[PDB]
């Protein structure tokens, strides 16, 4: 059967992903009937006290990104993503939710455990081109107003940044993401453009490390020019 | 015919002159501001040939207004 943290897990995630869309909806029972709801009851933050053989657990859970879910134990911070699909350590898991007036009741599979709600710790549960986008991405989509799980944003956004600046400095982020594209729309090629795209690819990456390396914008765009 | 002339490809429509004059005022005059757009292009950089100029700008728009609206180049008035 289950293992207790990916219970809590699982459970936290459950309610809180239940209960933000639910949010959502309730959002949108206010606006079509008028009234102003305060923002506060989009609900984010899902408090969970969960007490399994006499130890309370103190939850809260935090929609983190589009795709993802921060399960927070007393500030603690542990990233999920769903669609029920589930994403974890190292495997693709199934659950059920039965709810009860106060008690917690979650099936994985054929499997069932149970908690009753009525202790402070972290999980350890953890290129260049991907690193850039993502971290990229993730803090606009926080600072488009999806909000903030736990104090650690105002370092994690320091290292964030350095990140991205610096890997904006470098220059392989054009040949990292002209490679990987251009790799992944291979076929459906006319060659001129192919030999063209794949040499100066190529030579980007032979320039690449110099002091003085610069895309040949003009020069790609120029080929597709004539031939378009 | 002008069925066969155009699906050969030496002209690029068919029209009904009753609608001739709406049609062909809208077209022209864009016509005529994409030349003078053109004239500015060639003036920031000679090495480019009118044809690349074609497409570019044609680039420009696709960019600018998005690649759903595409199809709109061919309206007119757009």
Same mark, same amino acid.
């Given at each position: 059967?289950?293992?207790? %943290? ?7 995630l459950?309610?809180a992903?239940?209960?933000?869309? &639910?949010?959502?909806?309730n959002?949108?029972?206010?606006? !079509?009937r ?29 929609r ?6 921060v ?6 911070c542990?990233e ?6 589930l ?10 939710? @039965? !709810? ?9 599979? &054929? @499997? ?21 986008h993502?971290?990229?991405? &993730? ?9 903030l799980?736990?104090p650690?944003?105002?370092s @994690? ?9 610096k890997?904006?400095?470098?220059p ?9 594209? %251009?790799? #992944? ?6 060659? &001129?453009?192919?030999k #063209? ?8 990456a #032979? ?5 003085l ?16 | ?11 690029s ?15 022209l005059?864009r ?7 053109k004239?500015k292009?060639?003036?920031?950089n000679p090495?480019?040939?009118?044809g ?16 759903? /609206?595409?199809?709109?180049w061919?309206?007119? /008035?757009?």
């Open positions: 059967r289950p293992d207790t %943290m990916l219970g809590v897990v699982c459970g936290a459950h309610v992903d239940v209960s933000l869309r &639910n949010s959502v909806s959002f949108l029972h206010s606006l !079509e008028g009234q102003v709801l305060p923002a506060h009851t989009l609900l984010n933050t899902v408090d969970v006290e969960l007490i399994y053989e006499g130890v309370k657990y103190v939850l809260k859970v935090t983190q990104s589009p795709n993802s879910y399960v927070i134990m007393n500030g603690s542990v999920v993503d769903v669609h029920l699909l994403s974890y350590d190292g495997s693709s898991y199934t659950t059920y939710m @039965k !709810e009860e007036v106060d008690r917690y009741r979650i099936t994985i599979g &054929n @499997k069932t455990c149970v908690f009753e709600k009525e202790h402070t710790g972290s999980l350890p549960r953890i290129k260049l081109h991907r690193v850039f993502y971290v990229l991405d &993730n803090l606009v989509n926080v600072m488009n107003g999806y909000c799980p736990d650690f944003f105002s @994690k956004v320091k290292d964030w940044v350095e990140r991205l600046m890997t904006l400095r470098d392989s982020l054009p040949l990292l993401e002209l490679q990987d594209i %251009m790799t #992944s729309v291979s076929g459906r090629i006319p060659p &001129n453009v192919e #063209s795209i794949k040499k100066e690819m190529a030579q980007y #032979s320039n690449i490390t110099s002091v390396c610069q895309f040949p914008s003009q020069q790609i765009a120029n080929i597709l020019d004539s031939h378009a | 015919t002008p069925g066969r002339m155009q699906e050969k490809g030496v002209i429509d068919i029209l009904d002159w009753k609608t001739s004059r709406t049609f062909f005022y809208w077209r005059r016509l005529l501001l994409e030349d003078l757009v004239k292009i060639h003036n920031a090495e480019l040939t009118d690349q100029i074609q497409a570019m700008l044609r680039r420009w728009f696709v960019e600018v207004e998005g690649t759903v /609206k595409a199809y709109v061919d309206n007119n /008035k757009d």
